[PDB]
Amino acid sequence: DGPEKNYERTMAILQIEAEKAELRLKELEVRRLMRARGDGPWFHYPTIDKELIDHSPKATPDN
Amino acid sequence: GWVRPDLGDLSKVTKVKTDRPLPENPYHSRARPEPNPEVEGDLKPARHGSRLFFWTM
């Protein structure tokens, strides 16, 4: 291989690896925020579903 | 002039006309918490794949 091919092939390798490294660091930061704040799709622990609730008039009024 | 209601009459659900205003918040509920920011967009392939250590896919 001529030096130009290896040189520019090296750049393509560096671009891919650099982009992956940045994404790896961002994911660690996103995961840290979602776990602490609970406002993301990750670490979304279930809560009781409100469609299970019966809203019809009851045998007694105070409820 | 009183007529005894028939079998089944008094167990009917009837309708009442009342000038009383319908309550707004009979349960005295607080404002509900805001829903989590929804996610919208086009699903694209993962950038450079799994990105797991050395794997290229």
Side-chain angles (χ1 to χ4, degrees), chain A residues 13-25:
Chain A
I13 288 157
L14 279 167
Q15 167 168 77
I16 286 160
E17 294 296 310
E19 272 158 7
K20 291 196 298 202
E22 305 281 23
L23 292 167
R24 287 202 194 94
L25 296 171

Side-chain angles (χ1 to χ4, degrees), chain B residues 3 5-6 8 24 37:
Chain B
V3 176
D6 286 321
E24 325 86 55

Side-chain angles (χ1 to χ4, degrees), chain A residues 33-50:
Chain A
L33 292 163
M34 285 198 215
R35 193 162 205 166
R37 300 197 293 216
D39 51 349
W42 307 341
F43 315 98
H44 194 257
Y45 308 143
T47 50
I48 288 154
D49 178 12
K50 82 184 165 114

